[PDB]
Amino acid sequence: VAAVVVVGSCMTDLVSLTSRLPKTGETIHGHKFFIGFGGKGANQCVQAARLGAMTSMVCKVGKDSFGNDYIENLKQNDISTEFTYQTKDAATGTASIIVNNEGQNIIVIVAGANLLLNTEDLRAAANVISRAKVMVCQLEITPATSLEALTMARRSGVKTLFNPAPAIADLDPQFYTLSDVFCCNESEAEILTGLTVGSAADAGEAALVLLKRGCQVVIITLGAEGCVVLSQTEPEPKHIPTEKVKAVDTTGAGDSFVGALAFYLAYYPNLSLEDMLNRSNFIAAVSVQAAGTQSSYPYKKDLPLTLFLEHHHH
Amino acid sequence: EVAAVVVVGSCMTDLVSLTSRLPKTGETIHGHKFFIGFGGKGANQCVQAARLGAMTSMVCKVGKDSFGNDYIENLKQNDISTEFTYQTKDAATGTASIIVNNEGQNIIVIVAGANLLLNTEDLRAAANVISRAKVMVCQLEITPATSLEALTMARRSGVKTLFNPAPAIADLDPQFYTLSDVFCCNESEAEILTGLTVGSAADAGEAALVLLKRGCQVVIITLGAEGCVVLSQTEPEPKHIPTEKVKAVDTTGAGDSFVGALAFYLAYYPNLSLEDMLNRSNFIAAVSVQAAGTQSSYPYKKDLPLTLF
Ligand SMILES: [K+]
Ligand SMILES: [K+]
């Protein structure tokens, strides 16, 4: 039985390495091309699975080479692919990425088959969603399909973890009221609230705006500075810090955090928010210490034992 | 079946994202469509020649990867010999990552990859097939030493060399000119090679003369919708070959259609005048611009007017 169900996106990463980023109208040469696996939903599902969750990825890829390769990627990470759909009507979602030697990038995402994940698909997955502990979704599929997944989860008493990423300024109000845990970064919080979010203090003002729209719990991540959390029960912002590490490549850190949080909500529901967030902050900070996105996500066996205690730890 | 046209050159996977806006540094943007196509100037030329009825052989190197296996299949499906289509685990298949906005402005990143690892040992295996061909076609998308050796081998056997200096670089090895029986480029490439501005047929005549004096036998500069300009050692006065106006749907790949058509006529219609070959090639490339995509747009003999054959 899958405890963590992720309803969301898979994207093939098409990466070119160059010495400089091209501007409009330019043709340049790069020195290396490679393919990787991305998409916020799959990234989150991968981190959760690597921590030991029984996960299932509800998603749609193309009936194409990239799609077949993505299903294999899921299987290699011990993710259930019982609800990984294919479609002849769109290509697998893509992220075309150009990266320079200092790690600055240009990215073009084409959602593709992710947008064809539909009501009929969720109805077929209705039984798996209904039986989960946590349903995770983002905004890299059709927003109406994420709303439907949240609705289905709420109707079954399944905890909803909503990551409004990438953010849209005027989200349907039901996104907030159907969210048990609403988790975003500073740039997303800016789009959602119309406030500056650079610091912890700014994040607590933004978080309260989001809380009043009907979320149970709001979490705004702060990069290397950890995160801020509020809840209906505890509306005063808490700043949960992260011990400083030497970052190698911060790509994918957000999704690591969210996947770790899903793991804790499902497997350690007893734990306070503060405890879950310290742990999740730590795991994401491990990911930044290695190259790449999914490749950087740590496994349970390579992490400290204290991350897996049933009870609160100092 | 003895190949009359041998192409020693590139195969590239075209990875195309269509957007409404081109990204600036640090930005993620969302586009509306992605597609994969088979490209590379060498393969594009080979495909157009094959669709006109040429017996062709593609000498190239792709990766031991999904894109490379798919490319070999693409060549076989277009009736091209893949006897000397190699695969290597040491680089990925060449890629062109192309981002195009709705006004047709683009950002392109080329990673030549496995193309660059086609080496002289790989060529030497094709010596017999090269020796028996009528035309050898090369571009500037693989490693220069390899293309130079291909041209050299062709010359040693009396095989006509058709060289396309594309993409152009300012200070090309002089042997590219002296090994070229027919040297064919566009206006932008001629500007890079000669340092001259080319914004008219007359200007292209001046640029073509520079290329001629560097040691080419025949020089052709294509002028987009305005046809082409040709001159030769035997007839150094530029001739402008115009083309009838058509409504372009997508001009991508038109140059390679032209070069592939010219290879076909050099190989199979050697007694036509150069002017006649160029009229026909201009026409075929103008058909290609009337359909979307690169290789998908290249016409077959059966769909073309009988008078071309
Ligand atoms: K990383
Ligand atoms: K075309």
From Swiss-Prot, chain A:
Its EC number is 2.7.1.15. It is found in: Cytoplasm; Nucleus. It catalyses: D-ribose + ATP = D-ribose 5-phosphate + ADP + H(+). It is an enzyme of class 2 (transferase). Gene3D superfamilies: 3.40.1190.20. Belongs to the carbohydrate kinase PfkB family. Ribokinase subfamily. This is Ribokinase.
